[PDB]
Amino acid sequence: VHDPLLAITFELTLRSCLYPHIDKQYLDCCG
Amino acid sequence: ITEAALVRDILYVFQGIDNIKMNCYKVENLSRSLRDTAVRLSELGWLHNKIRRYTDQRSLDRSFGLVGQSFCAALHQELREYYRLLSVLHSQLQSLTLRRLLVWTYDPKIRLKTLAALVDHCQGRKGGELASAVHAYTKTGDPYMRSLVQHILSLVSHPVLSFLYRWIYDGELEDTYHEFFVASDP
Amino acid sequence: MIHELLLALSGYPGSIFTWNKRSGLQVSQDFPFLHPSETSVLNRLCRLGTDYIRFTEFIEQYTLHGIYLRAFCTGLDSVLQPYRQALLDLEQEFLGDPHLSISHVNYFLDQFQLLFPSVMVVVEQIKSQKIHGCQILETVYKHSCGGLPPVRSALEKILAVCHGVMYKQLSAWMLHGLLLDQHEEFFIKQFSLRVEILPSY
Amino acid sequence: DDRVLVTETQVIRETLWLLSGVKKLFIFQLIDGKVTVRNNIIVTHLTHSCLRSVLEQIAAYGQVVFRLQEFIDEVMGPFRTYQAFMWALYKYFISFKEELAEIEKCIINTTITLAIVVDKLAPRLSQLKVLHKVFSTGVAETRNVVRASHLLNTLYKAILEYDEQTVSLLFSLWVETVRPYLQTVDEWIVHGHLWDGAREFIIQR
Amino acid sequence: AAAAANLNAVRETMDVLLEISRILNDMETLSICVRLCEQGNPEALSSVIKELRKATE
Amino acid sequence: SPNVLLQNLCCRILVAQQFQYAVRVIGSDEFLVAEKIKKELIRQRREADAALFSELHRKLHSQNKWSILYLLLSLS
Amino acid sequence: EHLILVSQLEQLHRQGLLSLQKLWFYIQPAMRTMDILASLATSVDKGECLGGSTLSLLHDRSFSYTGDSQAQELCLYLTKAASAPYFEVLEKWIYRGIIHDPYSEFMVEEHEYWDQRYTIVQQQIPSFLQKMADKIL
To answer: Which GO terms describe its biological process (chain D)?
Structure first.
């Protein structure tokens, strides 16, 4: 999932778009 | 002391590097019919050492200004040309003689006589006052000089027309060195 | 000896062209095979080699710190590119006809001989005054208003890439609220403003 | 003093082998893991000393590529991070090797000399110098959890220093080294258990 | 070997002559003129070449 | 040999009448030539080309000559 | 062009082909040209001529050679060249009113109610504009 994100300001803000993959997944588990 | 040795040293006196030593280049034997033409031919070096030193001494301090530097820079494109001709002449020394050299270096004894007398008429001129003292050499009429100096003027007067096109359309004059004829008061 | 020289002008000193840590590149002494009058033009030619060596040694050393110093050296190699490329050519011309002397080789440098000298003190002012931060974007600019056309066209390139850093940081701040900095470079440090480091123009 | 008097083109071929990472070369005979130029090499020109100068620089590059090849060797002959790190390094070498190998083609089949192959290899000898500093922090170090954490953290720090072709290298070198953690992290989430080997993860349960 | 060296020298001389002609200004015509000049006069050859050019016009 | 070369030159320039005229015309120092060429270049000016010509002349000697130069000067 | 005619013989001499009797033939044209320029350079300094009177002389020394054709194609090259600067101020006085003439040499000089402003100077008339010395002013 991280690799396709590279297809669609480097490694600091760019890395800040990886967490939506790891956070929504978390929200389901705790929920 | 053959004739091939003098041509060996003369090709170096044309630059400043010294039989022929250093105001005339007194040569120190050989026949009189040789010393005279050497003294005459070497006169091109004394015109070359003086012009090179002027560009160098001024290329050291930044006090000359933008207009001055431009004129000093214009004295190098008219020296690369003088540094190329020597290379072609150098390749033939391996035949040319003093008589052959005279018909070779008869023209660059004139360009090295306007430039070596253009840097003395404008000695202490810093700023536009320099671009006004290399324009007082165009009223000459000589079609070979008036078409040389009227080219150095086209380079020296480029920075002047850079402030003018700035102080007219934008009104923002900027010259740490006082060159433009519009002086501001803080 | 030609290919020997074209390496000495590249940054590799040898027996014919000794290297001294203080003075710079220079010819050792008189050589019997060559003429005794050339011993001068080479010394005039080495005044250029010393510049490239002292350039590339500083470029590699990166020395002081800060991105604006990193990018300055990053750009400093770009202006220095035509020097190298024009040096590779000299070998090709000598490979064709074997009748070319040092005179022609000295003549070929022409433009580099009147450029390096003016772009040498710009480096010296940095290493001798600890010019830290964005203050470089003025120290290089105050020398960009020089008369020499070649120089006026060289430093402008360096200022054109050095601005790329500010333009990177400036856009990163004006739309993302954060300032990417860890050495107090950009002129902003409840935030405030900086004046003692702000550019001139 | 005697000397071998090698020809000119032979040096470039030897230099390419040094770039390749091969050992036991008539030139650049290493002694103690440190490549070093021989002493009897001389060309018709270059006065026997400039050659010792120009080769000495390329030798400094051989050290960068010989040490890395020694590193990859000590992994082939379950850390899951170093082994995953070399695969990124190894992948870079194959592509780099192709450019050097291609040049060898134009040698046997246009004039080519020393000062040309070097300037042709500028955007490579630049990218290589970075690895000598990135890897230097991945070799100077004992537990398996500090050798892998301190390595993976050095990259993310070294990239923020470089924020173009040098960034594309470090980034493409980063993803192929954080692949282990991103796997176990996901595996811990969806499969509900932490499946670590040699206690590689930082959470030593 | 010696014959090959002579051929290289002739080619180099022809290239130099062509450059001189361009500055004072084809290659096949120059080669024919050079061979005739070597045999033997020069002013007469120039007059004939000028007349031939006028006839072609 | 010379007659054959003249016929070939006439053919390149272009017939039989012209060849006959050329034959009739045919039937009918170096330093000085170089100086004359330099003077002609000066009249044309320009100066840079003259310097190049001097270098070219030296190269030809390094690698009869007067006759070839005179023909080139006549063409101008 | 005389410093070259000395060079060709030198090259020929390096071959022995220049006997003294052979010299006395080659210099024949260079003995006649240098005998015209050494007669204008002594008829320009005899009576001090500058401006116009040094252009009247070069229109009479060119008419005295009306049948030589080897010393008239010369004195017609000097006059055609020593009169362009005089004719470049005349193209400023006829097509406009401005008279530059830094040195006092033009035929018309200004002053500082209008019959005294511009006055025809009598000396500096080229003696071939004498017919139209009035329509110019």
So the answer is: cytoplasmic microtubule organization; meiotic cell cycle; microtubule nucleation; mitotic cell cycle; spindle assembly
Query: Strand pairing partners for C26?
Result: C18
Nearest alpha carbon to residue E45 among E55, E56, E35, E37: E37
- The conformational region for residue G93 under phi > 0 = left, psi -120 to 50 = alpha, else beta, is alpha
Cβ–Cβ contact G3 with B under 8 A:
yes
Contacts of the segment F35-41: beta carbons below 8 A, 24+ positions apart: F35/B103, F35/G4, F35/G7, F35/G8, F36/F73, F36/G4, F37/E24, F37/F69, F37/F72, F37/F73, F38/B103, F38/B104, F39/G1, F39/G4, F40/E24, F40/F73, F40/F76, F41/E24
Q: Among candidates D129, D127, D20, D117, which has minimal Cα distance to D66?
A: D20
D25's tokens:
């070369």
Amino acid making up residue D152? L
Provide the token pair at B173. 């004059």
Structure tokens at B63: 């006090």
Shortest Cα distance from B66 to chain C (angstroms)? 4
- At B20 the three-state DSSP class reads strand
Q: Does B107 contact F at CB distance below 8 Å?
A: yes
- Please state the three-class secondary structure of chain C as a single string: CHHHHHHHCCCCCCCCEECCCCCCCEECCCCCCCCCCHHHHHHHHHHHHHHHHHHHHHHHHCCCCCHHHHHHHHHHHHHCHHHHHHHHHHHHHHHHCCCCCHHHHHHHHCCHHHCHHHHCHHHHHHHCCCCCHHHHHHHCCCCCCCCCHHHHCCHHHHHHHHHHHHHHHHHHHHHHCCCCCCCCCCCCCCCCCCCCCCCCC
| Helix, strand, coil in percent for chain F, rounding step 5 | 85, 0, 15
Residue C125 in tokens: 């002012």
State which amino acid sits at residue G57.
L
Q: Are C134 and C102 a contacting pair, CB within 8 Å?
A: no
- Joined tokens for residue G64: 């005295």
Find the CB nearest B88 among F35, F52, F61. Answer: F52
Q: Cα(B79)–Cα(B85) distance, rounded to whole angstroms?
A: 10
Residue of C nearest to B13 (CA): C37
What DSSP state is assigned to residue G83?
Answer: S
Closest Cα in chain D, distance from residue A8 (Å):
16
Amino acid letter, residue D140: A
- In one-letter notation, the amino acid at residue A22 is I
B172 alpha-carbon distance from chain centroid: 35
Q: How far apart are CA B48 and CA B10, in angstroms?
A: 13
Task: Say which DSSP state G44 is in.
Answer: S
Separation of alpha carbons G92 and G111, rounded Å: 17
Q: What are phi and psi of D40, to 5 degrees?
A: -110, 15
Answer yes or no: are the C-beta atoms of B167 and B173 closer than 8 Å. Answer: yes
Measure C27 CA to nearest chain D CA, in Å.
14
Say whether the B–E interface has 3 or more Cβ pairs within 8 Å.
Answer: no
